Design a protein around this ligand. Sequence first.
Ligand code: CHL
Ligand code: CHL
Ligand code: CLA
Ligand SMILES: CC1=C[C@H](O)CC(C)(C)[C@H]1/C=C/C(C)=C/C=C/C(C)=C/C=C/C=C(C)/C=C/C=C(C)/C=C/C1=C(C)C[C@H](O)CC1(C)C
Ligand SMILES: CC1=C[C@H](O)CC(C)(C)[C@H]1/C=C/C(C)=C/C=C/C(C)=C/C=C/C=C(C)/C=C/C=C(C)/C=C/C1=C(C)C[C@H](O)CC1(C)C
Ligand SMILES: CC1=C[C@H](O)CC(C)(C)[C@H]1/C=C/C(C)=C/C=C/C(C)=C/C=C/C=C(C)/C=C/C=C(C)/C=C/C1=C(C)C[C@H](O)CC1(C)C
Lengths: 238, 220, 219
Amino acid sequence: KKTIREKAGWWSNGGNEKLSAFYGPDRGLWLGPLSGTTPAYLTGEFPGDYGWDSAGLSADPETFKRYRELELIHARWAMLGALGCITPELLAKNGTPIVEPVWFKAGAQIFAEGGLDYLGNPGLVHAQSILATLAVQVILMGAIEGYRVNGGPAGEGLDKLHPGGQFFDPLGLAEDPDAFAELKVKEIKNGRLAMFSMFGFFVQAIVTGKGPLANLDEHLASPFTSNAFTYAQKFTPQ
Amino acid sequence: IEWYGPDRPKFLGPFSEGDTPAYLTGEFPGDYGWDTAGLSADPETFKRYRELELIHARWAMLGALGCITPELLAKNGIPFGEAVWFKAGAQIFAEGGLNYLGNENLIHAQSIIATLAFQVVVMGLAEAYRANGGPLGEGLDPLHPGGAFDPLGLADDPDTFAELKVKEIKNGRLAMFSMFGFFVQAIVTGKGPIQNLDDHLANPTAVNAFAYATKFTPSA
Amino acid sequence: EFYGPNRAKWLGPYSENATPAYLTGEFPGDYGWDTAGLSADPETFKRYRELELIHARWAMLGALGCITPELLAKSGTQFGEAVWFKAGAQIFSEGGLDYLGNPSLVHAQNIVATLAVQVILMGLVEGYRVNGGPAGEGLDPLYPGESFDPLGLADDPDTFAELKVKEIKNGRLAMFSMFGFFVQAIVTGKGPIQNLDDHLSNPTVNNAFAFATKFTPSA
Ligand code: CHL
Ligand code: CHL
Ligand code: CLA
Ligand SMILES: CC1=C[C@H](O)CC(C)(C)[C@H]1/C=C/C(C)=C/C=C/C(C)=C/C=C/C=C(C)/C=C/C=C(C)/C=C/C1=C(C)C[C@H](O)CC1(C)C
Ligand SMILES: CC1=C[C@H](O)CC(C)(C)[C@H]1/C=C/C(C)=C/C=C/C(C)=C/C=C/C=C(C)/C=C/C=C(C)/C=C/C1=C(C)C[C@H](O)CC1(C)C
Ligand SMILES: CC1=C[C@H](O)CC(C)(C)[C@H]1/C=C/C(C)=C/C=C/C(C)=C/C=C/C=C(C)/C=C/C=C(C)/C=C/C1=C(C)C[C@H](O)CC1(C)C
């Protein structure tokens, strides 16, 4: 019905049927063609709506709103965390002299008497007091999150999840409402992937005990040799 | 300070005008406007959660006092074969059993199964009576029955009743927080609460929780 | 009765004012236990009922599957690893996972292929369970019938109701017992049948309280 170059995905700014796979009735669902009866409250109006409420926890619209905000905030924090749990180890295996690049050991760097050099450079942050660090952090993050929940110096009458003034959308990527609608989906999908992968970081720490990039490397060395089933008998009750 | 209505104190203070939900009217004690998770949107679930909060609060107050008291009495002279609270239960397996204040003549419990059996019998009776009433009440409030539970009569005035409700739920939230702390810092430290305070007071800057931070690292 | 207002309830005689208004005696196993109010919304209540019943059926199968190999183990079969919480580690043995000890029966050697086939078939069947398929286009999400009743036990509504109650109650029993399997495997480190044998050997001394001081931190 179309020509070759429209099939091949040319001609940007033809997007109103491309939101159909992420919003609306006939969108992609959590079990795909094997998920018939989506919850009636998951109408397809919000980003990331795949019809997954098996436990019915979001049946109330207001708790559904609160859960959406929880999801997006967790997603953003988990994206930052997934990037930050791999950046030091990548940089250390590329050769930056980070003293403890593994993430679940990265907090114990501040107890070495050379302090917490940021990239392993003593001329950088050079933090020694974990208590002063925590105090600074508590003050700043309390101000920050209280500003988030009601408003602050960066806009008060803005949305609770996507404020998008000149402080939180300073590149203007989301001025087109369709670009905004699909970027919301990209945000929530990358964020759900990051939350799943951060759960994976947690479990791979508690189970394996090495770094996540070290786990990737020892899996790529001999995958069938070394897997999560290698550590299946680790939590044996003795 | 009001504690009720729209101009009540709230859990983010000045930051709290637009965070409180529409359903958290300042009707119930301790309503600081904290339902970020929206778990109390349904009024019935809200009522059940209020009951859970208050019962956990009362049990946690009793338990906080019961974990603090024996240790204080322990250093203030009294014999306590096992004073620390997270091993106070293992006294049954000692030679002389669980003597109450160290007195071999007070209780002298030797069997934990019989202790537990009596406990289930009377706790079930009492909690069933709590749910649906009994010898100390027929159709009273599920949370503030009164009558048999006000022999002193502190809360016959509604305003005193309200302020004491707030005091109750707040001391109880404090005790629940403190009991959670007891748990986590017993698991982390392995010592009692009073000894943790003594150690923190001996060297506050290097005897805090961060000294036990690298304790749970997997390390292959 | 097991239905209506005059039904059996979770606290027995002390249960008249302990049941919510929304727990009408309509659904099986309604003893009036929603102290946490988690089923106030009828839709969340329906979803939680489905979760309860599916957990119940899976837990019944699992309870039988953890009891059976151990019984058969002392009854005379070898069972390289009979205990249930190490029955999975048979794949890493020399001869793999032989079903009843027979090297000729299955002889599974790779856990990743086993798992792959499992995800394949389980996803297919659970998606058919949610939205139907070759064994049911649009039947009840919980009691489909019509291919899951080759014997036809529940064509009468009253028999259907009483068997529903029996199902959900055997299943709650199995879920409790499976939770027990978990906690007392973690605590004891032995099988369920051996725990029963040890309890029957000396009931007053080798009960759970013998393992009470096991998880104390002790600095
Ligand atoms: C404007 C300043 C102000 C700020 C920033 C806060 C902030 C807070 N108040 Mg609040 N209040 C404030 C003013 C007031 N409060 C109150 C009355 C109350 C009450 C009664 C209560 C609060 C509570 C809270 C907390 C609720 C949010 C939360 O749970 O954090 C969650 C986020 C975290 C816990 C992040 C952790 C922070 C920290 C950096 C942790 C360190 C990280 C660890 C190392 C991680 C451990 C690693 C593990 C995983 C291995 C929060 C700390 C509640 C509370 O105490 O709950 C805890 C509560 O019950 N406030 C009054 C009287 C009217 C105020 C007056 O202005
Ligand atoms: C009038 C007497 C009567 C009493 C007291 C009870 C009591 C109970 N019934 Mg009920 N029933 C009663 C009559 C009847 N019941 C039933 C039919 C049922 C059913 C089908 C069910 C119940 C269940 C329950 C329980 C629900 C509350 C709960 O979960 O416990 C919470 C309280 C505790 C768990 C206290 C524990 C006691 C002990 C001291 C614990 C030990 C503490 C540990 C050492 C601490 C842990 C250590 C940590 C740190 C690791 C509760 C024990 C439910 C159940 O079995 O849930 C468990 C259930 O499914 N009943 C019938 C038939 C009509 C009755 C007829 O009279
Ligand atoms: C009001 C209740 C209360 C009180 C008085 C204490 C007091 C104490 N705790 Mg406990 N604790 C509590 C709640 C409490 N805790 C809770 C709720 C938790 C669970 C998160 C813990 C978990 C915990 C652990 C794991 C350990 C302690 C330890 C300690 C001692 C050293 C202080 C420390 O390391 O801080 C740790 C405090 C926390 C982890 C959280 C409590 C939050 C407080 C009440 C709010 C902040 C107030 C503070 C003065 C402001 C600081 C600002 C800035 C520096 C951050 C000290 C006696 C340590 C110990 O035994 O040392 C001897 C220890 O190992 N506590
Ligand atoms: C949907 C549904 C449906 C039905 O109905 C029901 C259900 C099932 C329930 C549901 C589901 C859900 C889910 C799955 C969830 C999940 C979550 C997660 C995973 C999260 C994470 C989450 C995650 C997160 C936050 C993360 C974060 C992170 C971070 C901060 C980080 C930090 C850091 C870093 C950087 C590193 C350094 O050195 C250190 C640290 C400090 C460590
Ligand atoms: C609000 C909100 C909001 C949003 O929305 C959401 C969320 C977030 C979810 C929410 C939150 C919540 C929370 C925080 C909770 C907490 C809780 C707790 C802590 C409890 C405790 C609780 C606690 C408790 C009970 C306690 C108790 C105690 C006791 C009994 C004791 C006992 C004892 C003692 C004496 C000692 C001895 O030797 C022995 C014993 C036997 C041991
Ligand atoms: C009702 C109510 C009311 C209020 O309102 C609230 C509350 C309280 C929340 C509620 C309660 C709830 C509950 C209690 C729950 C429980 C649950 C459970 C126990 C489950 C189990 C559950 C359980 C289950 C599934 C089980 C399953 C099992 C299985 C699969 C098995 C498997 C197996 C076997 C054969 C053995 C081999 O060698 C291997 C394996 C592979 C291992």
